[PDB]
Amino acid sequence: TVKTGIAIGLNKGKKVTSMTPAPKISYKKGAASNRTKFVRSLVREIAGLSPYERRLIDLIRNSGEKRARKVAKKRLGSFTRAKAKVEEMNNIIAASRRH
Amino acid sequence: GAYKYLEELQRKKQSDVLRFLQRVRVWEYRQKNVIHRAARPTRPDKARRLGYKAKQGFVIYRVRVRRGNRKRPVPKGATYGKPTNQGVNELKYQRSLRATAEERVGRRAANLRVLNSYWVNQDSTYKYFEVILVDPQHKAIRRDARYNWICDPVHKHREARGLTATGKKSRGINKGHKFNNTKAGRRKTWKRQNTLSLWRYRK
Amino acid sequence: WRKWNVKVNHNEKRYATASAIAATAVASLVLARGHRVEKIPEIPLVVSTDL
Amino acid sequence: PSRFTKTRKHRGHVSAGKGRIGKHRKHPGGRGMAGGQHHHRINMDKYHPGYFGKVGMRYFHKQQAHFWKPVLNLDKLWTLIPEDKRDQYLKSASKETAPVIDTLAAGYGKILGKGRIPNVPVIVKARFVSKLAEEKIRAAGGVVELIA
Amino acid sequence: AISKNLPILKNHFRKHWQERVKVHFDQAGKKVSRRNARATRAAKIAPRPLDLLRPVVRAPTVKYNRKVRAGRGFTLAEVKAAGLTAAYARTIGIAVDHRRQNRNQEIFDANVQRLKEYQSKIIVFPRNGKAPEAEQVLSAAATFPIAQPATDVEARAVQDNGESAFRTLRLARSEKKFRGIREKRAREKAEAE
Amino acid sequence: ALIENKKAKLVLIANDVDPIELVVFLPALCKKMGVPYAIVKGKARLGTLVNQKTSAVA
RNA sequence: UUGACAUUGUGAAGAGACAGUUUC
RNA sequence: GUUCUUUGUAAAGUGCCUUCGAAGAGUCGAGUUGUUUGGGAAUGCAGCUCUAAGUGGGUGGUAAAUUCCAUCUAAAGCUAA
RNA sequence: UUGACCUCAAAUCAGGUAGGAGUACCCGCUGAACUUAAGCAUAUCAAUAAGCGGAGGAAAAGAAACCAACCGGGAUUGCCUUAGUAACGGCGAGUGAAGCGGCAAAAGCUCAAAUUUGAAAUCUGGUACCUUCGGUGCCCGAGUUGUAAUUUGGAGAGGG
Ligand SMILES: CN[C@@H]1[C@@H](O)[C@@H](O[C@@H]2[C@@H](O)[C@H](O[C@H]3O[C@H](CN)CC[C@H]3N)[C@@H](N)C[C@H]2N)OC[C@]1(C)O
Ligand SMILES: CN[C@@H]1[C@@H](O)[C@@H](O[C@@H]2[C@@H](O)[C@H](O[C@H]3O[C@H](CN)CC[C@H]3N)[C@@H](N)C[C@H]2N)OC[C@]1(C)O
Ligand SMILES: [Mg+2]
Ligand SMILES: [Mg+2]
Ligand SMILES: [Mg+2]
Ligand SMILES: [Mg+2]
Ligand SMILES: [Mg+2]
Ligand SMILES: [Mg+2]
Ligand SMILES: [Mg+2]
Ligand SMILES: [Mg+2]
Ligand SMILES: [Mg+2]
Ligand SMILES: [Mg+2]
Ligand SMILES: [Mg+2]
Ligand SMILES: [Mg+2]
Ligand SMILES: [Mg+2]
Ligand SMILES: [Mg+2]
Ligand SMILES: [Mg+2]
Ligand SMILES: [Mg+2]
Ligand SMILES: [Mg+2]
Ligand SMILES: [Mg+2]
Ligand SMILES: [Mg+2]
Ligand SMILES: [Mg+2]
Ligand SMILES: [Mg+2]
Ligand SMILES: [Mg+2]
Ligand SMILES: [Mg+2]
Ligand SMILES: [Mg+2]
Ligand SMILES: [Mg+2]
Ligand SMILES: [Mg+2]
Ligand SMILES: [Mg+2]
Ligand SMILES: [Mg+2]
Ligand SMILES: [Mg+2]
Ligand SMILES: [Mg+2]
Ligand SMILES: [Mg+2]
Ligand SMILES: [Mg+2]
Ligand SMILES: [Mg+2]
Ligand SMILES: [Mg+2]
Ligand SMILES: [Mg+2]
Ligand SMILES: [Mg+2]
Ligand SMILES: [Mg+2]
Ligand SMILES: [Mg+2]
Ligand SMILES: [Mg+2]
Ligand SMILES: [Mg+2]
Ligand SMILES: [Mg+2]
Ligand SMILES: [Mg+2]
Ligand SMILES: [Mg+2]
Ligand SMILES: [Mg+2]
Ligand SMILES: [Mg+2]
Ligand SMILES: [Mg+2]
Ligand SMILES: [Mg+2]
Ligand SMILES: [Mg+2]
Ligand SMILES: [Mg+2]
Ligand SMILES: [Mg+2]
Ligand SMILES: [Mg+2]
Ligand SMILES: [Mg+2]
Ligand SMILES: [Mg+2]
Ligand SMILES: [Mg+2]
Ligand SMILES: [Mg+2]
Numbered sequence A: 001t002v003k004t005g006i007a008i009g010l011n012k013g014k015k016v017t018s019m020t021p022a023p024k025i026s027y028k029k030g031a032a033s034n035r036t037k038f039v040r041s042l043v044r045e046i047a048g049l050s051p052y053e054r055r056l057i058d059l060i061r062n063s064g065e066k067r068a069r070k071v072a073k074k075r076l077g078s079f080t081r082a083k084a085k086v087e088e089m090n091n092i093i094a095a096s097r098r099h
Numbered sequence B: 001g002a003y004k005y006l007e008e009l010q011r012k013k014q015s016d017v018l019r020f021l022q023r024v025r026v027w028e029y030r031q032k033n034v035i036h037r038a039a040r041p042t043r044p045d046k047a048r049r050l051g052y053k054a055k056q057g058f059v060i061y062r063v064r065v066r067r068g069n070r071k072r073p074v075p076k077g078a079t080y081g082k083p084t085n086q087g088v089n090e091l092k093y094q095r096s097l098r099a100t101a102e103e104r105v106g107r108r109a110a111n112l113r114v115l116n117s118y119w120v121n122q123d124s125t126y127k128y129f130e131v132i133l134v135d136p137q138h139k140a141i142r143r144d145a146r147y148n149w150i151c152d153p154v155h156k157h158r159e160a161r162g163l164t165a166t167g168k169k170s171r172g173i174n175k176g177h178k179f180n181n182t183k184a185g186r187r188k189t190w191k192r193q194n195t196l197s198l199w200r201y202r203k
Numbered sequence C: 001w002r003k004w005n006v007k008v009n010h011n012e013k014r015y016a017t018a019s020a021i022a023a024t025a026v027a028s029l030v031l032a033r034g035h036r037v038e039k040i041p042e043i044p045l046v047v048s049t050d051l
Numbered sequence D: 001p002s003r004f005t006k007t008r009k010h011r012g013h014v015s016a017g018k019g020r021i022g023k024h025r026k027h028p029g030g031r032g033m034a035g036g037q038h039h040h041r042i043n044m045d046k047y048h049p050g051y052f053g054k055v056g057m058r059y060f061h062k063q064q065a066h067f068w069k070p071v072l073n074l075d076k077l078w079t080l081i082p083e084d085k086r087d088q089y090l091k092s093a094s095k096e097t098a099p100v101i102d103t104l105a106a107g108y109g110k111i112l113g114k115g116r117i118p119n120v121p122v123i124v125k126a127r128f129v130s131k132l133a134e135e136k137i138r139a140a141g142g143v144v145e146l147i148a
Numbered sequence E: 001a002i003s004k005n006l007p008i009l010k011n012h013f014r015k016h017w018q019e020r021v022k023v024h025f026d027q028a029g030k031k032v033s034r035r036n037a038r039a040t041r042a043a044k045i046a047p048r049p050l051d052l053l054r055p056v057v058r059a060p061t062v063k064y065n066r067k068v069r070a071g072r073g074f075t076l077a078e079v080k081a082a083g084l085t086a087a088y089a090r091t092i093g094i095a096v097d098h099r100r101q102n103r104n105q106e107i108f109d110a111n112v113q114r115l116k117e118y119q120s121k122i123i124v125f126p127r128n129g130k131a132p133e134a135e136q137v138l139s140a141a142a143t144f145p146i147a148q149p150a151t152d153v154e155a156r157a158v159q160d161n162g163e164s165a166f167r168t169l170r171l172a173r174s175e176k177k178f179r180g181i182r183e184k185r186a187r188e189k190a191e192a193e
Numbered sequence F: 001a002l003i004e005n006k007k008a009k010l011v012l013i014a015n016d017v018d019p020i021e022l023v024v025f026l027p028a029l030c031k032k033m034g035v036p037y038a039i040v041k042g043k044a045r046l047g048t049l050v051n052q053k054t055s056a057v058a
Numbered sequence G: 001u002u003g004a005c006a007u008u009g010u011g012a013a014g015a016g017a018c019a020g021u022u023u024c
Numbered sequence H: 001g002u003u004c005u006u007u008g009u010a011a012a013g014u015g016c017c018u019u020c021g022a023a024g025a026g027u028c029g030a031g032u033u034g035u036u037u038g039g040g041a042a043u044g045c046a047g048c049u050c051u052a053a054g055u056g057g058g059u060g061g062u063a064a065a066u067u068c069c070a071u072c073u074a075a076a077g078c079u080a081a
Numbered sequence I: 001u002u003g004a005c006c007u008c009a010a011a012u013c014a015g016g017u018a019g020g021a022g023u024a025c026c027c028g029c030u031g032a033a034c035u036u037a038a039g040c041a042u043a044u045c046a047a048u049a050a051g052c053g054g055a056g057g058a059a060a061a062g063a064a065a066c067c068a069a070c071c072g073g074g075a076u077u078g079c080c081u082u083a084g085u086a087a088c089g090g091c092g093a094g095u096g097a098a099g100c101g102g103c104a105a106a107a108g109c110u111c112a113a114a115u116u117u118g119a120a121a122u123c124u125g126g127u128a129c130c131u132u133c134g135g136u137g138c139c140c141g142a143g144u145u146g147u148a149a150u151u152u153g154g155a156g157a158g159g160g
């Protein structure tokens, strides 16, 4: 990424003529893959919501995406999981009973 | 393939359905002997990905373990010695509940070898496991090139040495800076750094 | 784990042998060392490569 | 070797050299660094003043060699050139033909100023420099090129 | 237990250390034991070289980045650029490492050349008959050493733009120091005029 | 994989299967695929016509 | 010994808040 | 070393365009307790509680929100010196 | 009336297998106190002794959810180093690693998840014959709640 040829500073490093190799197929280890997208969403409408999942949606419907995230952050491990688990309900609640 | 479905279906445990199964099944598992012979895997999706194969010479065993902590089994809680080691009741037990399960069925069918195990169920008192054993002397296995490594003697009772998965976990065998102590194996890695090396011409 | 071998400096070793070689001339030392050389042609004794 | 040892001269002498009153006993001091701030205090202050307490920032997971920057001054700097090709360059101080001294190739991270090179111009390829170092260089007609 | 003027020592023998003493009396014994077992591979291994061909590689960190030594294996990218399959190049006594990556043309070039030079210097015995008896070479890395690419020429023109090379070092450091704060002063700037 | 490709036409699902999970997503999957399905009594009856001891799908 | 979570399911009546999903 | 049979309408590697690419869950992760570690707002381990995702996930040795970058693919397996 | 299927049993049923010994070295569990700190509780001794389970000629570890921050490196183990250092510690007594580098040995990999679906292609046993660490015909049985081939991320698969 265009190093500067000097020892210190911002972009510093040895000038060398770069290459940019192949991508690796363990990079994409998390990707969509149509059958999973299908089998997962197929299981959702088999299974439905679990007691902590419903409770979460009645919170967004009442108390908003904030108290939702916080109580989710308590329910799962982290703030990032709570984020996209709440968002997962945003897109449940919009399509399901709001559309 | 129906397997993938089963995998993502068992991943919803508190889903309104599997709770029904978990509840009814946990009643039945508790109604048989603590160690009883599983006719088939109740998770043929998971078992097969741990190395179960449908053929002759694979066994599934179901085994119950009591849950919770390990009480230091001292009489009247009496430690005798300095107060750090005085603790009776908050004590953890470094080996997994699944580790004890594999061992107790391993001690049950000794002729077998223990391939692996998985959690099927639990409640309060007992955690319920299913162990997959491979018969090392059965010719469909012996002649099987993928699984015949198990018939070697160095794989005897691998669950009592912590060479199953639940062992290679609790033993903390893993790469990288979080594992420095237990990596190459703890007492091993220890003994070395506490070895004094002395050369012929002294360094 | 008693110390058995002893380390010597390479150059010191070589200095030693060097001084030891130079004494294979210098007849008196060879004589004073045992070695009945009072009658041999010369020091040092050099001999045909045919040996 | 035990024959030069003084415990041989002390054979017959009853107290071994250790005194009749004061004996030689197990640990009159305690063991090792015991008594550091109490009975052995007069030693540890002087001798090792500063041995006690805390001083500075903690560094977690410090690795040396982030910090590897071996130093060379203009004190030598020409010693980098092999002795033979060296004399060719001393006489024949010139631009357009100037010795190229790669200091990082020599194992050096920064060039310092201990001072007095000859007036030969020298092209010095370095990682870092002292200001005064690099000044003495240009004062003699050389230049410094930074590298990585 | 503290006396005269001496360094404090931390001499660590407070466990049962006499149990864990390891003396090498077999230093010589094992040198032989492993010299036989080398030369007894050189037989059982047939005319094969006794080692595998290794890549040129730039050493890590800032201390050793200046240098280069043999890496583990040859990067599928180079194995294909030298024009053979990996799975075959395994059996030619080339070592191929599938983890290594090429960010460097100059190293990738260097390594392909090193690869063809080996294909040229080797004779591959055919599947069945013949075997034109070949007198094994004991190394590969000795046949195919690694020397440090030359970074420069002997002498060259003094070219002085007078930018002090130091002043450069200071600013390059400052530029990194107040950088995120000059972006905060382009953002606190962005919203109000 | 025959229902997911719709190449299946008439699909049968037993009312046995003690590890029920094996067969349960099928009424869903078939409905999702517009494939007529039916739940037949016994997994052994499915086996006889298919020459197994049991099948649970035909 | 006391409390909380878990083992822990299904109703009814009286309340608790943006019609009933939910809590004493 | 030789020599016999020819395994074949069998098996294998290579270039291009196109379409894809399934990758392990009471796990990972979190709280807590105990223990252990040089690992220090917590190194591993285990116990109970909570319990994920799929452009996701782990790590990046100071807790946290945010925007980036780097690096690997866990929770299944074997293997001589 | 019969014949299945699932589950569970019984046989001195057919044939195999486990135990115990040893335990210097090895994989785990459990686990002290003496002692040091001139007292002593955290700490130290020591993740040691003792007790317990499990192996092999080696065990283990291992083809990265690695290390790094470089111009990057590239499974594991070992020696020399890192280093009595970063760090931990009534920051007391004490403790205490890792990354790079040189070196020894080198070696790589394979499953689950895929419809063979124009054909369960897979397998133990029994029996008979035989060129007997096995081959063949036939017969029971395993097995679709999935045995072969195929693919394992470095990839790879379906097409043209
Ligand atoms: C337990 N492993 C040790 C490893 O830690 C290391 O031990 C060093 C030892 O070699 C050092 O010593 C070495 O270096 C000294 C100069 N720095 C000179 C003497 C030399 N033997 C000690 N000063 C410190 C230990 N941690 O090197 C030897 C070893 C066996 O690999
Ligand atoms: C006991 N007095 C000694 C004095 O005899 C002498 O001791 C050295 C000693 O330091 C060396 O000891 C050390 O030397 C190397 C140091 N890295 C390797 C490790 C160790 N053997 C000895 N090999 C030779 C003595 N004459 O120099 C140091 C001293 C303390 O003055
Ligand atoms: Mg790149
Ligand atoms: Mg992709
Ligand atoms: Mg069976
Ligand atoms: Mg208990
Ligand atoms: Mg005790
Ligand atoms: Mg304690
Ligand atoms: Mg691992
Ligand atoms: Mg440690
Ligand atoms: Mg050792
Ligand atoms: Mg070491
Ligand atoms: Mg020591
Ligand atoms: Mg002496
Ligand atoms: Mg004398
Ligand atoms: Mg005297
Ligand atoms: Mg006297
Ligand atoms: Mg006397
Ligand atoms: Mg005296
Ligand atoms: Mg006396
Ligand atoms: Mg007195
Ligand atoms: Mg005295
Ligand atoms: Mg005092
Ligand atoms: Mg510093
Ligand atoms: Mg400094
Ligand atoms: Mg250079
Ligand atoms: Mg050098
Ligand atoms: Mg000290
Ligand atoms: Mg002992
Ligand atoms: Mg070798
Ligand atoms: Mg300049
Ligand atoms: Mg900074
Ligand atoms: Mg600032
Ligand atoms: Mg192929
Ligand atoms: Mg291919
Ligand atoms: Mg995985
Ligand atoms: Mg909290
Ligand atoms: Mg809590
Ligand atoms: Mg313990
Ligand atoms: Mg990512
Ligand atoms: Mg990432
Ligand atoms: Mg990389
Ligand atoms: Mg692995
Ligand atoms: Mg292994
Ligand atoms: Mg009877
Ligand atoms: Mg019998
Ligand atoms: Mg025994
Ligand atoms: Mg003692
Ligand atoms: Mg004491
Ligand atoms: Mg005392
Ligand atoms: Mg006392
Ligand atoms: Mg013992
Ligand atoms: Mg060996
Ligand atoms: Mg092994
Ligand atoms: Mg490595
Ligand atoms: Mg190593
Ligand atoms: Mg050695």
Ligand SMILES: [Mg+2]
Pocket: none
């Ligand atoms: Mg030392």
Ligand SMILES: [Mg+2]
Pocket: I092
């Ligand atoms: Mg004190």
Ligand SMILES: [Mg+2]
Pocket: I095
């Ligand atoms: Mg310690």
Ligand SMILES: [Mg+2]
Pocket: none
């Ligand atoms: Mg298959």
Ligand SMILES: [Mg+2]
Pocket: none
């Ligand atoms: Mg891989």
